[PDB]
Amino acid sequence: RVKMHVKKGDTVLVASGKYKGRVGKVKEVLPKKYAVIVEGVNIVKKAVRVSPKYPQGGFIEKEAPLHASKVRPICPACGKPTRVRKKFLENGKKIRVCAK
């Protein structure tokens, strides 16, 4: 609603910057930030050494959100924008000389 977009829980390419050319699976959509996740971009989160679940250690991070505009879908080829087909009754998205 007003904030829907291009991709979801599928395979994508990253034409971004530092991690250009990278390709990854389900990007856990936000979308209240227009970011995703993929398996790219990692950093080093300090993480204080508290017992809860990090009993003495601290310096492990997860996957950076990554602004959704920097990713592009890929199917039976490389990138390419996206088109929409009727499905003769329901509704589905197809590429441009490809599918879904």
96 closest CA partner among 77, 87, 32: 77
Q: Which of 44, 52, 84, 88 binds RNA (CB under 7 A)?
A: 44
d(CA 18, CA 12): 16
Position 11 contacts RNA (CB under 7 A): no
Q: Which of 19, 22, 26, 98 binds RNA (CB under 7 A)?
A: 19
Residue placing its CB nearer to RNA in the complex, 5 or 25:
5
Task: Write b or e for each residue in 69-92: b if 16 or more Cβ atoms lie within 10 A of its Cβ, otherwise e.
Answer: ebbbbbbeeeebeeeeeeeeeeee
Smallest gap, in angstroms, from Cβ of residue 69 to RNA? 4
Please list the residues that pair with 71 across neighbouring strands: 14
How many residues touch RNA (CB under 7 A)? 34
Q: Which of 8, 15, 29, 63 binds RNA (CB under 7 A)?
A: 15
The amino acid occupying position 88 is F
Q: Which parts of this chain interact with RNA (CB under 7 A)? A: 5-6, 15-21, 34, 43-49, 57-59, 61, 64-65, 67-70, 72, 78-82, 96
